[PDB]
């Protein structure tokens, strides 16, 4: 894997239909859940990049070289069949390896994006919060809805809550 999407974060949120990643906060005003648009779009861009690169066709034209109606001579027929089968094997190998390799990277990059957003919030809170261990951040200055929103759009000033938080350890 990477840094655990299916690790310390135990499960995903089926209720999160607003994006691919997001925050779920809890305070004195109730329950809150909002998606993160930029990190979601980062993931979406990369996968879209893959798909559009993979979904593609040749502009190379191949013709008929044997005959379904009146069979060609055996010796040239067997060479042709032997060659075609060989190309089939190569493309069968390429195809299955391609898809397998891409799927490994797709899953891992999604892991990557989740880890990147997570450790970003961690640096965003400085010493005002502590790592829960399940992807959560226990805040030590009772953050209100406006405070939470400042964390979401990366504007949270750590040094304006620092005194209160470090006191409460």
């Amino acid at each position, epitope marked *: 894997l990477f840094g655990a999407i299916a690790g310390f974060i135990e499960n995903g949120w089926e209720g999160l239909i607003d994006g691919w990643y997001g925050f779920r906060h809890q305070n004195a005003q109730g329950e809150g859940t909002a998606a993160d648009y*930029k990190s979601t779009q980062s993931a979406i861009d990369q996968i879209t990049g893959k*798909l559009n690169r993979l979904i593609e066709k040749t502009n190379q034209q191949f013709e008929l070289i044997d005959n379904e109606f009146n069979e060609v001579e055996k010796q040239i027929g067997n060479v042709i069949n032997w060659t075609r089968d060989s190309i089939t094997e190569v493309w069968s190998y390429n195809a299955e390896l391609l898809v397998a390799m891409e799927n490994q990277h797709t899953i891992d990059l999604a892991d990557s994006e989740m880890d990147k957003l997570y450790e970003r919030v961690k640096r965003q809170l400085r010493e005002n919060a502590e790592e829960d261990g399940t992807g959560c951040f226990e805040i030590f200055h009772k953050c209100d809805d406006d405070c939470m929103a400042s964390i979401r759009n990366n504007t949270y000033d750590h040094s304006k809550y620092r005194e209160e938080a470090m006191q409460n350890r």
Partner: antibody, heavy 126, light 109 residues
Framework: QVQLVQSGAEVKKPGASVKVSCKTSGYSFSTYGVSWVRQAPGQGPEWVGWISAYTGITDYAQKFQGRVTLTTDATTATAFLDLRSLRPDDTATYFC???????????????????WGQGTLVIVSS | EVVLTQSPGTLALPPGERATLSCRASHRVGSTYIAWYQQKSGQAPRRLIYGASNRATDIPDRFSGSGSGTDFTLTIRRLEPEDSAVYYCQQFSVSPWTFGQGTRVEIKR
């Protein structure tokens, strides 16, 4: 029915600041975002910039970096194009076009400049 | 950047004949990131082809795009009077998204 309706034509003095609007109807907003193309009289089309209505991320061409600012609906699903320090070269027809799927993975270029606005002439002269 | 150069500058052909419009890129662009547009004097450009060969909604099947790599082609199988316009190719693989200088199509008789 998806339609892009832009503001009326405009006349500005050189060195001023213009603001073209683009009202959105038909689709949902923040599912695509907008590309802007401008066309000088008797000349071809040239791409100006793109903004996501979903993330807010903007991408400009080098020519306009620093004097163009793209923004999106206060809440009414409408995109804006803000140009300033208007040269006489900035005299052109400014088109907005709905462009590129956002909060979703989709193959192909079906949502790439698929619907345009009627246009907006900007005459920059004294 | 990617330079799209179209040819010819001007194409003049009688109605019902076959028109072939070229767009040649400086760099290899994936077929998905290429579009063709029609524009008449005064109006907004309507999208004809997207992804190098896919027809847009309600576009007549006499407009067919083809090609790959650096060579792309818009074919008007049988010209109609209302096909007299200017045609631009576009690339949006890598920014800046660039346009071809265009090809004008004119009829006859």
């Amino acid at each position: 029915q998806v339609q892009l309706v832009q503001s009326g034509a405009e006349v500005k003095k050189p060195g001023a600041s213009v603001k073209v609007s683009c009202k959105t109807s038909g689709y949902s907003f923040s599912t695509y975002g907008v590309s802007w193309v401008r066309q000088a009289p008797g000349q071809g089309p040239e791409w100006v910039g793109w903004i996501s209505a979903y993330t807010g991320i903007t991408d400009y061409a080098q020519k306009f970096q620093g004097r163009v600012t793209l923004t999106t609906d206060a809440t009414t699903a409408t995109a804006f194009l803000d140009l300033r320090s208007l040269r006489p070269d900035d005299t052109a027809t400014y088109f907005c076009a709905r462009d590129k799927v956002q909060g979703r993975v989709e193959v192909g270029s079906g949502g790439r400049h698929d619907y345009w606005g009627q246009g907006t002439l900007v005459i920059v002269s004294s | 950047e990617v330079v799209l150069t179209q040819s010819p500058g001007t194409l003049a052909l009688p109605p019902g004949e076959r028109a072939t419009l070229s767009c040649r890129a400086s760099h290899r662009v994936g077929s998905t990131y290429i579009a063709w547009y029609q524009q008449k004097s005064g109006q907004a450009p309507r999208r004809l082809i997207y992804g190098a060969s896919n027809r847009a909604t309600d576009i007549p099947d006499r407009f067919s795009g083809s090609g790959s790599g650096t060579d792309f082609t818009l074919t008007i199988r049988r010209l109609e009077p209302e096909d007299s316009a200017v045609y631009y190719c576009q690339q949006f693989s890598v920014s800046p998204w660039t346009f071809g200088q265009g090809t004008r199509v004119e009829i006859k008789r």
